[PDB]
Design a protein around this motif. Structure first.
Motif, PDB file in Angstrom:
ATOM      1  N   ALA B  13       0.784  -1.230   0.000  1.00  0.00           N
ATOM      2  CA  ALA B  13       0.000   0.000   0.000  1.00  0.00           C
ATOM      3  C   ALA B  13       0.824   1.292   0.000  1.00  0.00           C
ATOM      4  O   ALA B  13       0.287   2.355  -0.304  1.00  0.00           O
ATOM      5  N   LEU B  14       2.114   1.203   0.323  1.00  0.00           N
ATOM      6  CA  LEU B  14       2.971   2.386   0.363  1.00  0.00           C
ATOM      7  C   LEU B  14       3.843   2.557  -0.883  1.00  0.00           C
ATOM      8  O   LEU B  14       4.640   3.496  -0.967  1.00  0.00           O
ATOM      9  N   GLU B  15       3.703   1.647  -1.845  1.00  0.00           N
ATOM     10  CA  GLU B  15       4.474   1.730  -3.085  1.00  0.00           C
ATOM     11  C   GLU B  15       4.113   3.036  -3.779  1.00  0.00           C
ATOM     12  O   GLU B  15       2.969   3.484  -3.708  1.00  0.00           O
ATOM     13  N   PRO B  16       5.088   3.666  -4.461  1.00  0.00           N
ATOM     14  CA  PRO B  16       6.474   3.212  -4.600  1.00  0.00           C
ATOM     15  C   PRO B  16       7.398   3.821  -3.543  1.00  0.00           C
ATOM     16  O   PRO B  16       8.589   3.535  -3.511  1.00  0.00           O
ATOM     17  N   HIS B  17       6.845   4.663  -2.684  1.00  0.00           N
ATOM     18  CA  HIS B  17       7.637   5.321  -1.651  1.00  0.00           C
ATOM     19  C   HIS B  17       8.390   4.323  -0.774  1.00  0.00           C
ATOM     20  O   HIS B  17       9.588   4.480  -0.530  1.00  0.00           O
ATOM     21  N   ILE B  18       7.685   3.297  -0.308  1.00  0.00           N
ATOM     22  CA  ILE B  18       8.287   2.238   0.505  1.00  0.00           C
ATOM     23  C   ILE B  18       7.739   0.947  -0.092  1.00  0.00           C
ATOM     24  O   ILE B  18       6.559   0.645   0.066  1.00  0.00           O
ATOM     25  N   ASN B  19       8.585   0.192  -0.788  1.00  0.00           N
ATOM     26  CA  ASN B  19       8.110  -1.020  -1.432  1.00  0.00           C
ATOM     27  C   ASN B  19       7.606  -2.090  -0.480  1.00  0.00           C
ATOM     28  O   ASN B  19       7.938  -2.104   0.712  1.00  0.00           O
ATOM     29  N   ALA B  20       6.784  -2.979  -1.030  1.00  0.00           N
ATOM     30  CA  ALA B  20       6.158  -4.068  -0.295  1.00  0.00           C
ATOM     31  C   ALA B  20       7.128  -5.050   0.367  1.00  0.00           C
ATOM     32  O   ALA B  20       6.819  -5.613   1.418  1.00  0.00           O
ATOM     33  N   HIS B  27       7.054  -5.752   9.063  1.00  0.00           N
ATOM     34  CA  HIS B  27       6.006  -6.110   9.939  1.00  0.00           C
ATOM     35  C   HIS B  27       6.284  -7.542  10.393  1.00  0.00           C
ATOM     36  O   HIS B  27       6.563  -7.784  11.560  1.00  0.00           O
ATOM     37  N   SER B  28       6.256  -8.465   9.438  1.00  0.00           N
ATOM     38  CA  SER B  28       6.419  -9.893   9.707  1.00  0.00           C
ATOM     39  C   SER B  28       7.720 -10.418  10.298  1.00  0.00           C
ATOM     40  O   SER B  28       7.724 -11.495  10.878  1.00  0.00           O
ATOM     41  N   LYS B  29       8.821  -9.692  10.162  1.00  0.00           N
ATOM     42  CA  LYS B  29      10.070 -10.200  10.709  1.00  0.00           C
ATOM     43  C   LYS B  29      10.669  -9.369  11.844  1.00  0.00           C
ATOM     44  O   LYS B  29      10.850  -9.869  12.954  1.00  0.00           O
ATOM     45  N   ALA B 164      14.688  -0.188   7.316  1.00  0.00           N
ATOM     46  CA  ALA B 164      13.572   0.657   6.993  1.00  0.00           C
ATOM     47  C   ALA B 164      13.735   1.150   5.549  1.00  0.00           C
ATOM     48  O   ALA B 164      12.776   1.640   4.974  1.00  0.00           O
ATOM     49  N   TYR B 165      14.923   1.002   4.959  1.00  0.00           N
ATOM     50  CA  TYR B 165      15.136   1.497   3.591  1.00  0.00           C
ATOM     51  C   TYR B 165      16.225   0.900   2.699  1.00  0.00           C
ATOM     52  O   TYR B 165      16.159   1.061   1.482  1.00  0.00           O
TER      53      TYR B 165
END
Ligand SMILES: [Mn+2]
Ligand SMILES: [Mn+2]
Ligand SMILES: [Mn+2]
Ligand SMILES: [Mn+2]
Lengths: 198, 198, 198, 198
Positions: B13-20, B27-29, B164-165
């Motif tokens: 949902a944040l693509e392309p600013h922060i890819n999936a 979140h998951s790890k 985070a990036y």
């Protein structure tokens, strides 16, 4: 004038343990940046000093420790790796290892522990305690250099910042550690170790 | 019993600013790990406490600060972002921003500065000073939570750890910062800000 | 080449709020010692820097900050005190106080709180935030100087190291803090204050 | 529920190496204060933990470590001293000393050095490295306890906070360190030592 040292090998010489993309960004971007910043910071410190500007000298310590430390850490780290790396040292280093850590295998697990133990950015190190006359493991946060902050002489350093492994191993640092052992250049580590003997 | 909060949106949902890929691993790890470790550490502290084992309590602080802090930081960070994000707040928050930082634009540059300024892992924050009754920017190292270590109430947090990036922006943190502004969920930040008013 | 500044008054000039024994020890022994150690440390850093020895520069940092900071802090400290001192400030500085902390007594409680709050050795401070353009209170550990570590401009400093009060007040730091208000040199604090806006 | 332990001797029992005034203040005021503050802090952490309030747990850490550590350190300290004390230890402990530090005098110089080296408040320590199975010297800032922060087992501790010597020795910490060797309770240090190997 500090300068970016050339890698001793090609960017893809450590594959598949450490891929070329990580190697390239590590030499050409991370290490390159800190050398230039180290130079800029030093110049500033030379001026602050000359004017007896103590406040300026203090405000400049973080940048000097980080950039200076980073340059020290990578210059050593590159030499600590090799395409011929892996295995175990022999002679005195190996003998000291068993001596101070029981066995080479126990040693790996301990240095692996300190390295994975770093909460945040940092380095795991195998260093030499000149005063005690023995080997010692230490973990340093961010770019704080081993000798400059603990007095221990650096022998083997395992960079554990996330730019040392995230692209390839992601959040699983243990896989990175397990892998790096395959490229440790023990000849260099031994050299450094012997330089402490003399 | 602390638990991993569900993201408010999809991983892409944040693509392309922060890819999936970053979102999913985040979140998951990363966040999932600290919640579980936080629980393990707390249990241990409950036992150390009950026995009046002060030494155990002290030795456990780093893990509690890091895992607890990490859980606090991500729970807030997720809410701080949105697929509708970006732009600027309005009303009191925006008014406070200009008030305490001159203009929204100056504010971005300042928070961007503290965030890029973090040497090593850390977070940049826009928080509220209850005592001074005004906004304030602060940078926190590793997982040290804003309120727990500075007393400031967290409004907007910009996670600046390399997980985070790095996969998307590599070593170029500024591009990550410039990009994240596009997904800041100002409605949430405003909510948090107003909760300080009352 | 740093030097120990003569006090602006007689060693017993601050009686009975701070006794002559303390003042004399504090000046001739404590401050004198950091002055000399600073000159020694700076000389070493001068050689290290000239040789490009980053490790040595890093190792010298704790001493430079401690002694350098010690010199900065005590120099300011002496000028913040006066036998004619005490009372309250007036004009702009006083206006800022009322505005930034509510009132003089609220400001006093806050500075006193920050000073009594120092765990171990340190200083409580009244500083000026040039960026935000307002007054700000802070505490610094050991001899870490206000500006060099926080960026704030020192206006009023209160030494809460035990050698600053123990001979006369023993463990009762609060009694020390109350007494010191009687010899504060607002004329000087004011000067530093007005010099901030320029 | 922690309590202040009675001293193993009379307040003036360590005369003239440490005078009665110091001993009494140190016990009844300084140690007593950390005992109470610890009980208060622990109670708060108990409520925080029961409520799952991680922020509060984090905020309480500095106080818990300071007071908790204060209690641990001073309790050990009192037992490390004796009016009959002094001289040198014998047997295993003494053997370890010669082996780990060369000789008793070399060990003394090292412990003294670590103690005089503490910048600000703190403790110098003789500890036992269970991992390496040998003696190790270390210094801790403020009230940070040896084991809880370093993992080392405290054998002998030397308080170099100014309230530990100032009334009698003023700024001359070295004079304090030399004198304290006369009242060391090696019987106790030995007990702690033999309890390490088990
Ligand atoms: Mn690196
Ligand atoms: Mn994160
Ligand atoms: Mn002082
Ligand atoms: Mn004490």
């Amino acid at each position: 004038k500090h300068s970016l040292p050339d890698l001793p090998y090609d960017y893809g010489a450590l594959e598949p343990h450490i891929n070329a993309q990580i190697m390239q960004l590590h030499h050409s971007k991370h290490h390159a940046a800190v050398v230039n910043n180290l130079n800029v910071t030093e110049e500033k410190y030379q001026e602050a000093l000359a004017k007896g500007d103590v406040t300026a000298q203090i405000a400049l310590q973080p940048a000097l420790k980080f950039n200076g430390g980073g340059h020290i850490n990578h210059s050593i780290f590159w030499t600590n790796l090799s395409p011929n790396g892996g295995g175990e040292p022999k002679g005195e280093l190996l003998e000291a290892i068993k001596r101070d850590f029981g066995s080479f295998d126990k040693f790996k697990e301990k240095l692996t522990a300190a390295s994975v133990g770093v909460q945040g950015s940092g380095w795991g190190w195998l260093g030499f305690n000149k005063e005690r006359g023995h080997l010692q493991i230490a973990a340093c946060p961010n770019q704080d250099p081993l000798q400059g902050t603990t007095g221990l002489i650096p022998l083997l350093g395992i960079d554990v910042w996330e730019h040392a492994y995230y692209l390839q191993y992601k959040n699983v640092r243990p896989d990175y550690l397990k892998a790096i052992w395959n490229v440790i250049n023990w000849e260099n580590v031994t050299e450094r170790y012997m330089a402490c003997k003399k």
